[PDB]
Design a binder for this molecule. Structure first.
Ligand SMILES: *[C@H](C)[C@H]1/C(=C/c2[nH]c(/C=C3N=C(/C=C4\NC(=O)C(CC)=C4C)C(C)=C\3CCC(=O)O)c(CCC(=O)O)c2C)NC(=O)[C@@H]1C
Ligand SMILES: *[C@H](C)[C@H]1/C(=C/c2[nH]c(/C=C3N=C(/C=C4\NC(=O)C(CC)=C4C)C(C)=C\3CCC(=O)O)c(CCC(=O)O)c2C)NC(=O)[C@@H]1C
Ligand SMILES: *[C@H](C)[C@H]1/C(=C/c2[nH]c(/C=C3N=C(/C=C4\NC(=O)C(CC)=C4C)C(C)=C\3CCC(=O)O)c(CCC(=O)O)c2C)NC(=O)[C@@H]1C
Ligand SMILES: *[C@H](C)[C@H]1/C(=C/c2[nH]c(/C=C3N=C(/C=C4\NC(=O)C(CC)=C4C)C(C)=C\3CCC(=O)O)c(CCC(=O)O)c2C)NC(=O)[C@@H]1C
Ligand SMILES: *[C@H](C)[C@H]1/C(=C/c2[nH]c(/C=C3N=C(/C=C4\NC(=O)C(CC)=C4C)C(C)=C\3CCC(=O)O)c(CCC(=O)O)c2C)NC(=O)[C@@H]1C
Ligand SMILES: *[C@H](C)[C@H]1/C(=C/c2[nH]c(/C=C3N=C(/C=C4\NC(=O)C(CC)=C4C)C(C)=C\3CCC(=O)O)c(CCC(=O)O)c2C)NC(=O)[C@@H]1C
Lengths: 160, 161, 161, 160, 160, 161
């Protein structure tokens, strides 16, 4: 988060936090609730968000789900939608900490190497997260939608 | 290194759960005490050189330590001691703003209790001195934040005790 | 890093001996097993991605290890684990070609067991994946070359215990 | 040999052996027999080769075996001949492995410091290896002579 | 000293000392007695010196001992003269080794840090050494005096 | 490293006092022995090659140590060992000048035994060689300066054991 990031820099320069790094921490915390709210709004419609994304994903790309595609079968489509749940959970983590280190350390570093051998087409995973993005920002107000949306796009770009 | 925000994120990630009801509470109350920790992190910075200068007095002065043959003797060692006092003060502040001791565990206490005894630093002294930092700093910020800085400074002493 | 031929040479040099007939016979057989080695390594190379894949599939997927809380959780550790399996496979085929395990001891097992114990990496599970790799590769390389790959894959996991 | 040399290359690049490297392994291996023949014949007449190389050598180096010389006296001349047997054995290790990594590590690295402290004229030991060369190759037929001779050439150049 | 120094130079280039260094050692070792007498005369009169140089330091910087001064109060002035006595000692160490190294590692590296935190005026410590220089060379004549004085300078210069 | 001079100074500073008469005496004894040390060094320098050759031929070349398999076997190890002796002679010659053994602890002995141990370098034979160097240098340097060099050659020696 912004707090640990400032600690990191100030420590690399053997110094106390600058007035600028303190203002930011003040402001990042003062907006804490805003963040929590956003996370809860998503977390509480977990299922609604995930299943919709699945529906859309599947229509735009009926491949992955036809015989021969990574998610064909019920077990298999279920593991796919489980993976979309994971990413939706990692998004709330970022929108909560206003930082992308968590999305990174958990679902980004090594993801291409993971899916590549899993035989999963990763362009498609990004697709799903895109639907996730719209299904979720659909339930948010304006500002809150801009915020949640940023973390969705980061994940998207990283998976595509 | 890690702050409370990540600490909570991780505790829930290890279980594959979304923010837990309890985690939001933990998180939220960390946000509320954010401004106090910043206010305190400011005065400690603005009075760091002073905090140490006073602590050394009520603690490491006019004792056997600074005379020939003790560990503070020579302008080389004396300087080295004050330097270490600044690290604890600054790292305690870092740890206080983060609400997590990981930065002390990773950047301060690691193989420190050894290095000391190796160079024959007088552990019990460095602790009586630290204690002085807690009191001196406490009087400037307040037992409210002094309360929390005490918890962290004591945390470095124990890493030596 | 030694070769089978070099291993034989050093064994007799420590004795200040010229190559003796049985020693020559050792070399004769290494040579005779030459093309079979430089061939199994050919198919292996071409199916290295597939081999590790079938090995993970039959070995680790869908279990405690992959779910939140296991050592193969996070994309980070998943890749890190696939990577290790690609390493063992490659280094095992190197050794085979050499008919000497010196390579593994120098480039592979040096300090591995600690390095894993300090990271919480499951020794028995990684060994399970090594069982799987031994199995998939043998089913591509043929029975003879399969046991030839089993000696070196065995030397590795057994070097983890 | 070419085996470990090829492995070392591939490992540095963190890859499997190239097709060129495997071809060479095959070529080197198929010819392994011929090489063992050579080591074999050199070994079976080791006594005659050295003894004969030692004569022609002292015949041209009467100063090395005459009073004041380094190899003066039956105890010294004996050891001198034993060094010749040393290098002869080393040459057979080279031919067999088709590599000089063995000759180098056993009798080349530090060879000049070693002889300079024993007060032995290296040139002289180089001329001695020239004697071992013709004495041995002579015992070989055809191209087997040009093979074994390249290693003798290696040791010769290293000793001067 | 001039012995330990040249040994380092030599060690650095992996060779035996040069004729120049050995000669420089002979010249230094030969005059070792004089250096001992000098340090002896100074030690013997340490109490005259430190007390005399102390009065001059006050008559020039009367503030130091005045109220809100760093050395106000017998207790405190006591420590101030002790420091002048510390530096008068370190000076004899240089004279005897003809090396400045011992003054540095004992009382120069980290001085500013120390005095800063004790609230002592470093420029005031310097002139106390300037006074010490005067009360000590006073007992010295000639070359014996130029020698000691050179070290006093070094200290004075490293404290200003 | 540190001279005997600096060695005396430090022993006094640790007591916070100016140089005692007993301290001046150590100093006087070092100064008056300078010419002897320099003259010894000059000789040990112009004869370092001969001193090593003779000590090798008189200690090591009367042992089995070079028969193949030997620790002194192969041209590489032969030179490796000759090089160590050279180091001993030079640094012992570093120490004698200094009248202090700190250079030996800091530049020659630190982790020397452990390295030999994990290398199979025999400590018994090295010690015997060093003593041969002690003896061969004494014959060139004289009995007086010979004894002084012995102190330092012995020191290295009794540090590996
Ligand atoms: C859905 C949008 C797409 C899809 C998914 C799919 N995934 C798998 C299998 C796995 N997925 C993961 C994913 C993760 N592991 C992690 O640690 C993280 C970070 C939190 C992620 C995202 C893993 C580990 C597996 C392995 C199985 C397991 O859970 O242990 C499958 C099954 C593959 C198989 O048959 O073995 C599928 C189908 N597939 C698609 O086509 C969609 C585009
Ligand atoms: C005198 C010219 C001026 C002066 C001196 C003064 N010094 C101190 C306190 C200390 N001084 C030292 C100095 C050294 N320690 C060393 O090891 C060496 C190397 C030989 C030196 C030079 C130290 C360590 C102290 C700390 C006290 C202690 O011994 O524990 C004071 C006291 C400060 C106080 O109130 O605690 C004073 C007054 N002050 C002046 O104004 C003069 C110009
Ligand atoms: C002061 C209260 C006491 C005291 C201190 C003293 N410390 C040292 C030397 C070292 N201290 C450290 C510790 C750290 N270095 C760091 O970078 C950090 C944060 C990342 C810490 C905590 C280290 C590494 C050293 C050694 C390296 C160095 O000299 O800087 C000394 C010097 C000892 C010596 O003989 O050289 C001293 C004197 N000593 C006391 O007597 C006080 C009670
Ligand atoms: C897979 C079957 C299991 C598994 C593996 C796993 N390994 C690590 C981390 C490391 N592995 C090594 C080993 C090597 N590195 C090398 O370069 C070579 C030679 C080419 C070898 C043999 C090392 C050094 C590490 C640590 C450094 C690193 O991460 O790269 C991890 C990571 C653990 C972590 O990040 O905390 C994992 C997960 N884990 C399993 O659960 C399987 C049973
Ligand atoms: C003969 C052509 C010339 C000659 C030889 C000579 N050699 C020595 C003594 C030694 N030679 C070696 C050589 C090796 N040791 C090895 O491990 C290897 C690698 C296989 C080699 C080549 C060694 C170690 C010695 C030392 C004694 C020992 O056997 O360990 C001598 C003796 C010298 C002396 O007594 O001073 C001689 C005479 N000398 C010549 O002039 C010929 C030109
Ligand atoms: C000679 C009397 C005996 C002997 C010696 C021998 N030593 C080594 C290897 C090493 N020796 C050292 C020692 C030093 N290195 C230095 O820079 C200095 C200066 C302070 C010293 C004293 C080291 C570090 C090594 C290892 C690194 C290297 O090999 O260079 C060997 C080699 C052993 C091997 O297997 O390669 C040998 C043979 N051996 C004997 O048998 C004599 C009794």
């Amino acid at each position: 988060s912004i707090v640990s990031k400032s600690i990191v820099n100030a420590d690399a320069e053997a110094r106390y936090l600058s007035p600028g790094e303190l203002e930011r921490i003040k402001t990042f915390v003062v907006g804490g609730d805003r963040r929590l709210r956003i996370a809860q709004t998503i977390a509480e419609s977990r299922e609604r968000i995930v299943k919709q994304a699945g529906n859309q994903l599947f229509q735009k790309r009926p491949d992955v789900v036809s015989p021969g595609g990574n998610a064909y079968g019920e077990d298999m489509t279920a593991t796919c939608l489980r993976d979309l749940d994971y990413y939706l959970r990692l998004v709330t983590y970022g929108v909560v900490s206003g930082d992308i280190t968590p999305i990174e350390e958990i679902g980004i570093v090594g993801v291409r190497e993971m899916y590549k051998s899993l035989g999963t087409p990763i362009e498609a995973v990004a697709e799903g997260v895109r639907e996730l993005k719209s299904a979720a920002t659909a339930l948010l107000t304006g500002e809150d939608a801009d915020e949640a949306g940023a973390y969705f796009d980061y994940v998207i770009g990283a998976l595509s | 290194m890690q702050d409370a925000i990540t600490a909570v994120i991780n505790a829930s990630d290890v279980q594959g759960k979304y923010l837990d009801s309890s985690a939001l509470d933990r998180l939220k109350s960390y946000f509320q005490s954010g401004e106090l920790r910043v206010r305190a992190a400011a005065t400690i910075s603005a009075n760091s050189a002073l905090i140490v200068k006073e602590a050394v007095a009520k603690s490491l002065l006019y004792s056997d330590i600074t005379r020939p043959g003790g560990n503070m003797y020579t302008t080389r060692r004396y300087a080295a001691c004050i330097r270490d006092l600044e690290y604890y003060l600054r790292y305690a502040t870092y740890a206080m703003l983060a609400g997590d001791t990981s930065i002390l565990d990773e950047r301060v206490l690691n193989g420190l209790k050894e290095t000391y005894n190796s160079l024959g630093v007088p552990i019990g002294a460095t602790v009586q001195a630290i204690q002085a930092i807690k009191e001196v700093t406490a009087s400037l910020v307040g037992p409210d934040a002094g309360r929390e800085m005490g918890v962290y400074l004591d945390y470095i002493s124990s890493g030596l005790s």
